[PDB]
Every structure is written in structure tokens, then in C-alpha cells.
């Protein structure tokens, strides 16, 4: 049971101001959103359980999230000099929060790792109070975050707002955030080619994620199958199976963390 405020940004050199998109995944389902080109200019509460809360926090949710979006434009004024470019570098600066609590109510371990242009720029560690810059540039950032008690403030935030708010959502979520939707299965013969067939397992609409579906009691996986994590248009996830077996000789693993 986790919680993460994904951030992202892009640049439009010579086209105005940079963008910013953010979301949230209390448990797994998306609940919060933001954009730099939307008309609401506010958080978008598109989740069923988290809607009854008072207007003040819906209005803010640190409405200075916009201030953070305007801080990122200042960050990409020295991130341009670090990976030295001229002015036109179209780049993304992603942000990765995360505050994972234990199922009883403990703090387990919090998470954070930032990256730039798909390359890690700075990250936290298990336990805390450590920086692991991964270039000749962000070593400056690592040493400076060492300078003014940065990880200590991160500890404050994690041991505070993360656990407090997250327990608040689990209280509000009731059973919507914790319902454990199991898969439903179907399969047929599916003859292929001229002398072979495919026995494709199907499982759709289950919740939450982390299902194990792999290929008379062996794992003969030596080829390419399946795309990625697959969203069913509401938050529910699904996976299928693929295999090639000869005609007449056709004779999958079914494991889910919430499997009945």
C-alpha cells in the first residue's frame, strides 16, 4: 500500500514557458492530476472515494504546486549549464516522490529518486541521509544537499505528511482502495500456421497489480511475448499468455498477490 506524487516537465525553447504534468497513485488507482495548459488550473479529483473532502484543501493541495512548476524553470537554467548546451535543449526533468507504509500502520520505507533526460540525477537510499549523484555535474547537487540538512527535512516530511495523509486516504478509501478484484480466465485452442497451435491464457480486469502468469510443471520461457503493464481503461489491469506448441501436442502459472 503505497502513495506517489509523480511529476514531469518538458521544455519548448523559443515557444513560451515549460509545461508540467503531475498525478497521484494512492494504492494504484489514479486520484489527482494537474497540468500547465488546463483550464481548471487546479487539482482534478477524478476518483470516487476521494471527493467528499473540504473545499480548502482541494483548492490548495499546495496550490504552490504551480510555484514548484515555476521553480523547475529556474532549475532548468543551471541544468542547461551542467550538461552544457546553448539554449535549445528540449529536456524533461522528472520527479519521484513516494511514501510506502506497512499494512499494519508503520512507516516501512519512503522513496525518492529524481532523474534528467532519462538518466538518474539524484536519488535517496534505503534508510536515509545519503546522496548518490551519477554524473560529473550532479556531484555539486549531492554535496550541497549534504550541506543544508536536506535529507533531514525529507525525513520530517516522510515521517509526517506521508503517513498522516496516507492513513487519511485509507480511512476515506474504505473498500474502494482495498477490494482485491480477482482475474477472470478464458482460453481456446487457437490453431495457427499449419502444424501448430497457441494455448493463450487470459485474465482481465483484476485488481490490484502484480499477477504472475508465466510459461507439465516447467517454465520454458526463451522467446518474446507480452508488451508491458496493460491498463483496462479504469485502473484495472490485465495480462494474457502466448506459447507455440505442435499440433496434437498442446499440453500456465497462475499466481497473484491477491489471488483467492
Amino acid at each position, epitope marked *: 500500500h503505497s502513495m506517489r506524487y509523480f511529476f514531469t516537465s518538458v521544455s519548448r525553447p523559443g515557444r513560451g514557458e515549460p509545461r508540467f504534468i503531475a498525478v497521484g497513485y494512492v494504492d494504484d488507482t489514479q486520484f489527482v492530476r494537474f497540468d500547465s495548459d488546463a483550464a481548471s488550473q487546479k487539482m482534478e479529483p477524478r476518483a470516487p472515494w476521494i471527493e467528499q473532502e473540504g473545499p480548502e484543501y482541494w483548492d490548495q493541495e*499546495t496550490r504552490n504546486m504551480k*510555484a514548484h512548476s515555476q521553480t523547475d524553470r529556474a532549475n532548468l537554467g543551471t541544468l542547461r549549464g551542467y550538461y552544457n548546451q546553448s539554449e535549445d535543449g528540449s529536456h524533461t526533468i522528472q520527479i519521484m516522490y513516494g511514501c510506502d507504509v506497512g499494512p499494519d500502520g508503520r512507516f516501512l520505507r519512503g522513496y525518492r529518486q529524481d532523474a534528467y533526460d532519462g538518466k538518474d540525477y539524484i536519488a535517496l537510499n534505503e534508510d536515509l541521509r545519503s546522496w548518490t549523484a551519477a554524473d560529473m555535474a550532479a556531484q555539486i547537487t549531492k554535496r550541497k544537499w549534504e550541506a543544508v540538512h536536506a535529507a533531514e527535512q525529507r525525513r520530517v516530511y516522510l515521517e509526517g505528511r506521508c503517513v498522516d495523509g496516507l492513513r487519511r486516504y485509507l480511512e476515506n478509501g474504505k473498500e474502494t482502495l482495498q477490494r482485491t478484484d480477482p482475474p477472470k480466465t478464458h482460453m481456446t485452442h487457437h490453431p495457427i500456421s499449419d502444424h501448430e497451435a497457441t494455448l493463450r491464457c487470459w485474465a482481465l480486469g483484476f485488481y490490484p497489480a502484480e499477477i504472475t502468469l508465466t510459461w507439465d510443471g516447467e517454465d520454458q520461457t526463451q522467446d518474446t511475448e507480452l508488451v508491458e503493464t496493460r491498463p483496462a481503461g479504469d485502473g484495472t489491469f490485465q495480462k494474457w499468455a502466448a506459447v507455440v506448441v505442435p499440433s496434437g501436442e498442446e499440453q500456465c502459472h497462475v499466481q497473484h498477490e491477491g489471488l483467492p
Partner: T-cell receptor
Amino acid sequence: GVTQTPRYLIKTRGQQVTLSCSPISGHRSVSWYQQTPGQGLQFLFEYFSETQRNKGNFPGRFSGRQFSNSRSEMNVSTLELGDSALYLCASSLAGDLGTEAFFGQGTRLTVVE
Amino acid sequence: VAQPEDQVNVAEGNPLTVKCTYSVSGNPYLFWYVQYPNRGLQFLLKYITGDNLVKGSYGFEAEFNKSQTSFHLKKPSALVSDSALYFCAVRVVTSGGSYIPTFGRGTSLIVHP
């Protein structure tokens, strides 16, 4: 890690002091001030291209120096009582208009008579 | 560059307000800092150029306004401690840059609960 040394110190009337400020890492700009309640910071000096860049108007006693490896020292040859109360050092990459400098824990050195 | 308020007070029910005035030539640039009691000078508010309602720290902010030639660092809800000698400063462009924190006696907030 803008560590300074010694962190408190005391000296009587008129001698020279050896006060050190150590920057975090590769930077070039060092600034010096005096955070005493009296007067103001007045910006002692900033140092650039192995040369004190910005200079005001002082009696000859005030002076300062840093090292090639960015280590920096203060030297106040003559003390005039209150004029040595509290001192600060700064470090920054290149010291541009849109960039800042970070300060150290200072050199609080409240002086005896 | 000097602001009248040498002492500002507030209770834990009102948004923090301070004064930050300035009058220089060319394009001004303002910096903000805070001096937590007997410690460093880590900043909370930066302005370079661009947007008016400038971003900030844990909830501080300031806005740029020629109609008063000042920022007046604002905060809708100060945190519990936030009791220090806040100050802001400007200095004009020179060869290489000047960027000096010449504030003047700052201002000391107290947050009586």
C-alpha cells in the same frame, strides 16, 4: 560543508587573526561580510581570477586571501574593539547575476575588553 | 534597499507579512534570506526575473511591483518556528557581477502561540 575554523575565537586589542573558511567543493567566488548589529555588512570583498574583484574603501589594516584549492582565510592585522564581532563567508560556482552564493556557519567571535 | 520594519510580530492565526523595499538603477534583482538563531544563512526566496507571484520555500512567497518598488515577502501560513532575522537585498550589475546581500538590520519575526 562551508565549514569555518575557528568557530568561536577571542582576541584582545590590535593583533592579527587567522580565520579560515572552507568551501564545500569546486567553486570560485568567495564573499566576506560582518553580521554585527552595528553598521552593515558593507561587502568586504569578493575574489575572482586569483584577484580581489570588487573593492570598496578601507583603512589599510583590512585584508584577505584564499588558496588555489579554494580554501580561504581572513587576516585582520589591527583590531579596533567592536569591529570584530561576527563574520561570514560565501561560496558559489561562478557568481553570476542569476546565481546565488551560500553562507557558512560564521565566525562568531564576541570579544572581551 | 532599506525597509522601515525593524521588528515584526504575529500570532499563530495570521499570514506572515514583512517589508522589502529597494530603489536602484538598471534592472534590479532581489535576494531573500533568513538567519535562524546562531546558525547559517540558508535562503528561502529567490527572484531573478519573470513571473510576479514569485515562488518560495515551505509556503513563503513574494511579488514584484514597481507600483511600490518592493516585494513584501508574504506567507499565508507561517510554520511553527519561523522566528529569525529575515532580510532582503539588492545590488547593481558590475563587471562579472556584484550580487551582494546588503539588506540593513533585517527584521525579526516572533510567532507567539
